[model samples]
Target chain A: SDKIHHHHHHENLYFQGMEITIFGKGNMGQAIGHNFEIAGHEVTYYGSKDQATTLGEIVIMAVPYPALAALAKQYATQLKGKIVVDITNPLNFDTWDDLVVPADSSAAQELQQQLPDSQVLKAFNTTFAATLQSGQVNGKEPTTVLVAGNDDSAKQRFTRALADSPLEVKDAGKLKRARELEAMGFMQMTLAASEQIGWTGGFAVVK
Target chain B: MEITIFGKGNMGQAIGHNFEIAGHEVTYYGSKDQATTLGEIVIMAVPYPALAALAKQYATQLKGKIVVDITNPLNFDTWDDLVVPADSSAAQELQQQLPDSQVLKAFNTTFAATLQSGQVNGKEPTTVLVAGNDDSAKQRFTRALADSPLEVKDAGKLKRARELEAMGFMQMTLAASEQIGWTGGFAVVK
Candidate 1:
């Protein structure tokens, strides 16, 4: 009875607030930092690789795709047995010309292979560095945050922690759909970078 | 608006009907001609690998005209493998060859089945995203598809083709999975 009470209590804590720590103070990191803070969650930005891999629940990894592998290895010890979120896009790494990850699978899948003990969820790669200023792309509601992962409970915990965020969360099915979301997210990044058109945009699922 | 569409495959047939419904003259051609006398606007509707040779053969007639590239250069050997190189896309290569043709990338992400119906699952009009360097041609091209049941989104310069190809490959993979089936098309959800 005591153990069950503890589990339920921990779950309730997530719905109220989450202690989120994001690595890399890059453009994306700052964007998320702003959003997470507006949502009433405590967000901490870290530049050093010398910290704990999983700071708390729903640990956010916001590094660039190329630097991720080395960083993954750097935090390999602390990464064990943690619920992690993949916030990086394999955006045509060389010149933003093509998706750098294995075209067949996805970047989240690759990271999961390394940190098997950690439950990896794909999300937040769609929002650009520019959108975090308002925490909403369309100027009305928050942008859609598409997420995909294999484990159910981990997905629930992650979403619960994001409960009050301005970001709207939608499940893109299993981890396999990472292949789809990454492409979709990468396309949004490419479109936002363009110098012309009303194409200054991102994805939103409106009902 | 008379148009010449290459390839006799399923996509060619659907797009032929796609334009014909809009009061545009549509002629489907299976083979190549140095001087393509079919129409002012030419559409490439072949498999991914064959785009180059056809563009080369029709090099003379394609210049200073509008060319639509609908091929996704996928790695056939590997299932769902997008074989196009990083720095260049099939659409980009087609543009580099013609040098003067107003090259636009379209139809690579739309399934042949979706093109036939124009609406995906009867819910929303299927979006046909286009990317090209030439603004004038892109506008006219968008106008034509906008007349059909398709919703056109200008995806910016010609370089967006590679990302679109990647998007197309992802679409192909989804259809091949047998979950969404072949009756689906990529929708640009606002």
Candidate 2:
């Protein structure tokens, strides 16, 4: 089972100062890059700096989903044999509406299609950028940084990169769970954009 | 809001108790009763299998009312598939069944026991994820449950009820398959 395999991974993974390439220089890109930097992981900027889209230990696709097809195409060659991280929620932001990604397919699945050799992992799309900037959601409850991907090695590295970062890290099953995670993001973003809750609100699996 | 809750089960009583304490007029109905009251917001608290008939029977009575569907449409026989379409969840299908009625999905995250108990983890207020297409309709119902012990989070359009059901289905799986039992609830931390 994928669950059992992923279970074996958590206890075995331990990484320090791995190179993390952060693509896109937007709000989430900077906040997440800074968070990982503060956590002692080396952060590299892509697109913001010239010749920076060059591959790193872990590549982060932080661009909007509309730009993702182009973003993926632009860096297809470098992404091979690399661990790619997807942080876009693929939500149609005009109304903060339903998922704009194709039905039964996730943002990660799209990136994987673009770069088939890369291990594409979904993480941080559900988390608000301001929450990551704060380093903690609430003083009592750590905001969950949920990561989902099928590739065990890349998944472990991606999860551990944020293990001691601004938020709490959770292994939210397989890559397909990104569907549910993005659904949560869509719901959370709708409420936030509508001002029911602020931009900081993010889902947590309470036990 | 004047509340008419269908079904005399634990869920109906639990919700009824909240509205009653909030000083709202509340009424309960059994399996074979007519929800003739036109001005009240209806909460469908019945089981999954019996929902269609109730929707059809109450269609005329429910025509302009805000109908809150509490049924999570997963077939418990195997818990593998839902009784409704994948894209259209229980609330969406129920809305179709009661076409003129405004159907919203809520209170599915809380366990039957917790909904009966009225506290999420004994001391905290449980978050009720509410989804509906009509913003004003959602606002009205959210305000109706405002003074209750539950925290309301508006989860986008009615199409999102399907997504909410997925979340609910997982919670149900947790209760049945995982050891979470009946104590789990969803919380969105900021």
Candidate 3:
């Protein structure tokens, strides 16, 4: 009853009713899965200890920066041929000071190197769980999700899956653009953590 | 409309264009040019290194005037890191240099092309994020743009210039690599 139906009839039902596999049942994972489900996709989740018996066409690792390595190693073979989305900001949680990833590369890029066969896309890292659940930025403007990937077709399909959702999804261009997205995310998170901007309010992309 | 810009580069000219449309008498001075007299509002649109030189030269004249900084303080040679200390920004440093003057940080996050067109990608209005400790100085700067198409926003205190500079640096890198167009930028929707 809460589903949002804004699909184009002419577009193929290729992404319709697809299975979505998400690891880490944290706030981000659940909120993102809720949006996918609202768009008519099936959602299933796996925990850190549980062994997944099956895999979906799209996989999202919503775990923290430190936990990604082990999950990637365990599901290395399963994640192949899937559109894997990396949402970790890779910030230093201890100090809340700096990014844990290298200045030259991002967490998404690092994930791509580990899962070469999987079509990796850097997304949702720029957005917080509150914005995703509410589908609005600061409870006013519509929230925007930026996706960056080297594969054009994969990125298109990923965005197409959210065509019926309330969130506005835009292709942020090549994987290298992830560097800027990471910086933007880092700054936004820092501002919120420091009480400059509320968690629900952030830098909204106008236009 | 009495404003003096210390640089005549793309950004200086573009900003001057906006001020001209807003009915301000815009005067531009190049790197080699010396200003015997400066306007009430002075804009340092030059590079990072030129800031100190201009501040030293116009120390007496800049007192009690509104000083606006538009430098990103990026390490242009490497484009990898900012030249300013991590805890401080170019705006803060300029404030320290001109202790008597009220320093405001603006226009560094925007490109010359965006400022010229007054829109991002010809869609959203170009928003100028200003950061400073003095509220009246920021208000005067915003009032100066009253007739222009550009939008002005208060991005918090002078310390917030650090975040604004990071945003500027990121945007600059994106445009330099051709990820986004010079005329296109991150717009503030809402």
Candidate 4:
């Protein structure tokens, strides 16, 4: 009875409500999917070629920097009234020395230009997949997620989506703030790539 | 008690004010030639271009003294890139110029507003990060501010100055763009 009682105690920890559709099934997509699923959201994944009959309300584009354009074009009508979260770092993968985006604009801003109807947000780029799963940096310090967007309600809604998760979220000001956030993400990625910081380790926004 | 600050600008006065509050006598020199005798601890709170001249002028007096470098070395004209090389930093360059002096990188990541108020956005304590090869140099600098409201943290050795400068550059760009107030900045909580 004790063994069955222990199993019953942990059975209903997750409750389903919101729908979260992730584009890629790679590391970031799966890691974030795990958090949202644990946060009581119905999670789904679709590859580049897979056709979805219906999309979720909150969609996460976990694909690479270049892949976002095609995804946005394909799901133009579907993502019209939904929340689109951009997690790509826009890093120049060829040399790993620079960002592909311009100095004045960020990937999120460019995506916003593409999807005018959709509420675009910049987030999850500052954190790596390992930290997202561990919910901590190097097994200590809470992994903070900085979300920047013009829409206040969308930012609040995104924060509420992770209410039950262990990761910490903060509003990084308006959409123009995405430029700095992207720069930070670019620096962190380069640091990790050069072995300056561990894959699980990153620049923690203290206080 | 003798603390010589090479600049009388906002950063110099802010830093000197903290030192004054800690009961240390502070003196300001607009240029390196103005000071006949340098203090045991010297803070180069001037711009990046001014460092070479100050290093050249006070090369003899600064020998065996703790030299603090607070310049960000950003290309002020373009605001596009750092003036220093990618591998080297302003502090490292100063260290090379003054080999006998104990060179440290501090206050570059912080703004004058934070240093004056001793807080980040009036919430967290203003943490001053110092990087240098000599442990004693960092120790003396930390001890000088021990009585003040500010907090001192050792951010590894002199090589770490490169990353610190990058952080400083990012923060400065944010402020210069009016994205964040000069009083608000990134804080090191742990």
Candidate 5:
């Protein structure tokens, strides 16, 4: 008698599902996590103090600009070979003039340097958390989400992950475009912060 | 009303076609050195780089005329520095160059397709933003935009062109991202 062949052997080696984890519990983290979970992916929430069991395949750092560096340092050990999404704007909230990163450098670039083994992608910084939660306006399409990263494969994966969200993903080239994106975000934030006009009115370019 | 368009590029031709279809006499000037006389309103549809030179050449001809600046000083090469500084805009700079001409910034936000077609979704009235230091000039341009199939939105002063440019950059970046799945014809609805 021939040895019994196990047809289900490949299922044991295949862990096809992806695990996404949110690092910050702030409005951005919560909104993104909510969208991810709604899109049928398993999402884990980790506050600043919570130590993740294992760094997820996709790890999102949604903390403020100042805290991002320290957060990246703390999670560097667990984040190897993972797609790290940096959503921090890295702006001087005090002056709101120019970016917090130097003229040529950017948060995504710095994150890439810090976590050499991880793939860093810059995205979701251009939109508002309110818009993210609402997703769409008056039956029209949702606002856009600009992305930049050095790794093409990782960027494609992140774009696929966000396919179900109410935001549209646009690639603004490599990490250098991050500077322009951050400045644009700063301008939009300044406009929203103005008491005279408020956030109810935002800007979108036609043609 | 008779309108003299300064350039015959895509944008210039679109505006010329729109105005001509509306029963307004539209004349287009392809070069600043060319001897084309002016109408009541002199529309400068030249590129931002040539704005100053063209404005100087046409300055003497544009006395006491309403000059519409449809050009955006977009620094496509270096995204770092704005084409004009934050405080000073292309319209303001043109106003300084040709002090006698009443400068108004319009059609900088609208695309050539929308301008020529004069319709969006076959229903909603497309909006054209107008800005200028002269209230009367803005009012006159506002009336012209209203005459077309577009809606007129007065965006305060000429300095507001800075905001308009910033908004324009955002729109272009988003469109380049293919996020909206639309072309040059989409509008930002309230």
Candidate 6:
């Protein structure tokens, strides 16, 4: 038998002092902040009105779809060692309303290109705010929150953050999934608006 | 334990009758009243707008009760903005209003007839996605769902209700787009 060497060591993998900054005090921002706070993490609200003087490990941008690019630009310098979460749905709000994204590409991909320096992750844009708050309804379990990003480490950090929150986080793979997710969101909005179907009583998933 | 349902519509009747058939005492409360006590579980099968009022009137009554919200927050008038934004869901809104009540999101995806019939026709079992923050309460509701004919799919957390809503929208769009008829419903084949 060849010489066998064994080394035993215990390492602390616990994230006890992880800090996160949530931008935009809208429903998404507030919900993410609440979930993080509940999970024993220190969360600071960094709304556009009041920017954060210092940066955290993660900067979540929960701003409106139109303002994502500008917001990313504003925080690009501060986001050097941090991951940026882009939870915006880029819709034209006009022509080609039915299509997921334009013939060119998706909003997430566009945001990534616009902010090449920052590690961007797309998440939480597909689910409803109410779902984020309660986690379940009637008796069924809540669906998974789909996430997509280019950086593996950043994606892992987001997965951890989502696990800490009251959600089942599913990796939808890459930024390309943004088109499908956004299309899903648009379709959902359209359906919820139709009186024939009584949108108030409708929802969807793989099953 | 008694399970009081808070809607008199088709869905309300279907669920109430189902629970009644299951030997669980079911009470139908179309509107808020002083007599209704806090049961072990309260099912809010009511419309979206009445959620706040019902919660306000029944908060004390449902102090420690499990409240199942089958209502979807959708504004039929405007297709522009979601009735509830992408971040939050109606169940969470109800939970916030009545923090004492354990609110869960379910039965929104399945049709009223499915609940009434207790069968997904000859096809595979119909999937009913459930979302909630409380694990115990979610399990209790899952048990209730298991008693029913449809298949219960645990969708993880209440926030995923946003995706469920989105999924529901996709189904509706498919029907509207003439890809599938209104009679079509979703099912987890595996």
Q: Per-model C-alpha lDDT, please? A: 0.72, 0.73, 0.82, 0.81, 0.70, 0.65
Q: Count the backbone clashes (under 3 Å) in each candidate.
A: 1, 0, 0, 0, 0, 41
- Compose the digit string of candidate 6's lDDT tens values, residues B1-190: 5888888898899877667765677877776444447568888888888888888877688889888888756666753234775566787788888887778888777666666776443334455667788889888876765566666656556665665665555444434445344444443322
Sort order, DockQ high to low: 2, 5, 3, 1, 4, 6
Pairs of colliding residues, candidate 2:
none
Candidate 2's residue-wise lDDT over A1-207, tens digit each?
Answer: 211211123453334466788888889999889777766667888763346644677888788787777767777887788888888878766755467876566888878878889888888887788778886554334566777778878878777667656566666666776766676666677667667667765554445
The segments of candidate 3 whose C-alpha lies over 4 angstroms from its true place after superposition are A1-15, B1-4, B8-27, B30-33, B37-42, B46-105, B111-166, B169-190
DockQ (model 5, Cα): 0.23
C-alpha RMSD by candidate, in order: 6.3, 5.6, 5.5, 8.2, 6.9, 16.5
Per-prediction DockQ: 0.19, 0.48, 0.22, 0.12, 0.23, 0.05
Query: Which 10 consecutive positions of candidate 6 chain B have the poorest summed lDDT?
Result: B181-190
Per-chain TM-score of candidate 2, chain B: 0.92
Error of 4 at B26 (Å): 10
> How does the DockQ of candidate 2 come out?
0.48
Q: What's the lDDT for residue B175 in model 1?
A: 57
Higher-TM-score candidate of 1 and 6: 1
Evaluated at residue B72, the lDDT of candidate 4 is 88
Model 3: clashing residue pairs? none
Give lDDT tens digits, candidate 3, residues B1-190.
5999999999999899999999999999998888888898898999899899889999999999999999989887888678988657899999999999999999998888889999887766788888899999999999998899898877777877876887787677656756566787676544
**Model 5, range A68-169, lDDT digits (tens) per residue?**
788788878888899998888787667654456775567888888999899888887866666567664223445566788888889898877766555566
For B26-87, candidate 1 gives per-residue lDDT tens digits of: 88878553333747678998886788888877787787778999987877886635666654
At residue A143, candidate 2 shows an lDDT of 62
Off by over 4 Å in 2: A1-16, A138-140, B7-13, B25-39, B47-49, B74-83, B110-124, B133-140, B166-184, B188-190
Query: Where in model 6 is the C-alpha error above 4 Å?
Result: A1-207, B32-35
Candidate chain B TM-scores, in order: 0.93, 0.92, 0.97, 0.97, 0.88, 0.88
The clash tally of candidate 1 reads 1
